[PDB]
Amino acid sequence: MASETFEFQAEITQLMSLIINTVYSNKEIFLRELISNASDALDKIRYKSLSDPKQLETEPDLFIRITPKPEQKVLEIRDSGIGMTKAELINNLGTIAKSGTKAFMEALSAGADVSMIGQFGVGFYSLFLVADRVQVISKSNDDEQYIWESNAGGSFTVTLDEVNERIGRGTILRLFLKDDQLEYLEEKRIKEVIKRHSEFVAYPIQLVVTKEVE
Numbered sequence: 001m002a003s004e005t006f007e008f009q010a011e012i013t014q015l016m017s018l019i020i021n022t023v024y025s026n027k028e029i030f031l032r033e034l035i036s037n038a039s040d041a042l043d044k045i046r047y048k049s050l051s052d053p054k055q056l057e058t059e060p061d062l063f064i065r066i067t068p069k070p071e072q073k074v075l076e077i078r079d080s081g082i083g084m085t086k087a088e089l090i091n092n093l094g095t096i097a098k099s100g101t102k103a104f105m106e107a108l109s110a111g112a113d114v115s116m117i118g119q120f121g122v123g124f125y126s127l128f129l130v131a132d133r134v135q136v137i138s139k140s141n142d143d144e145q146y147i148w149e150s151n152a153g154g155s156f157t158v159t160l161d162e163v164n165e166r167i168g169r170g171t172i173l174r175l176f177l178k179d180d181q182l183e184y185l186e187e188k189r190i191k192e193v194i195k196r197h198s199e200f201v202a203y204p205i206q207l208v209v210t211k212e213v214e
């Protein structure tokens with residue numbers, strides 16, 4: 001189907017521009033922020049299910065799963081959290097981050113470390129440290145599966161999903177890695193980053209590794 005195009009709140013476009021271009025050394029912090037967001041979304045579906053247990057039935061398994069796709073230079077981070085409807089994708093990713101992004105950029109101006117980004121509630125955008133494009137594929141129990149896409153420019157698209165694997169419920173962040181950040185496709189590197197900055201996660205963190213049978 002046809003994609004619909006939307007404009008980001010301008011301060012989010014400013015933040016994306018700063019992040020995709022920064023020469024900040026510690027780019028690996030992106031993974032912590034995305035694992036944190038995944039964990040939060042899983043918190044949300046668990047909490048919602050306390051009073052509406054059927055909500056878990058679309059995907060009873062609660063997990064965070066990381067899949068490198070070397071041939072496409074893609075890294076996927078999936079969770080079986082609450083997901084986002086079309087309206088939530090438009091709102092959560094293109095609008096509500098306006099306030100945090102403004103305050104965070106002022107902090108960056110003054111010398112704050114880019115790693116503080118999560119404390120300003122806008123850690124999602126740290127993916128542009130390693131990626132130049134992202135598709136957020138999401139399925140909420142309350143809507144169809146949709147794809148939100150951004151290349152850090154001022155507009156994003158949202159498209160009903162007729163091309164990706166069905167998610168039972170949850171979200172996949174599909175990161176198209178920059179040419180000099182392909183280390184994040186490697187098994188050893190990924191495990192090293194996770195072990196370092198994400199030790200207290202309540203959900204299993206699965207790593208999908210592809211190997212040749214010899």
Ligand SMILES: CCc1cc(-c2[nH]nc(C)c2-c2ccc3c(c2)OCCO3)c(O)cc1O
Nearest residue numbers: 037038040041079081082083084092124171
């Ligand atoms: C914002 C990026 C993102 C969102 C989700 C997700 N799925 N469903 C919801 C309600 C969310 C979400 C939304 C806002 C947010 C989140 C998670 O983490 C704390 C900060 O702000 C997700 O599951 C993964 C992910 O990377």
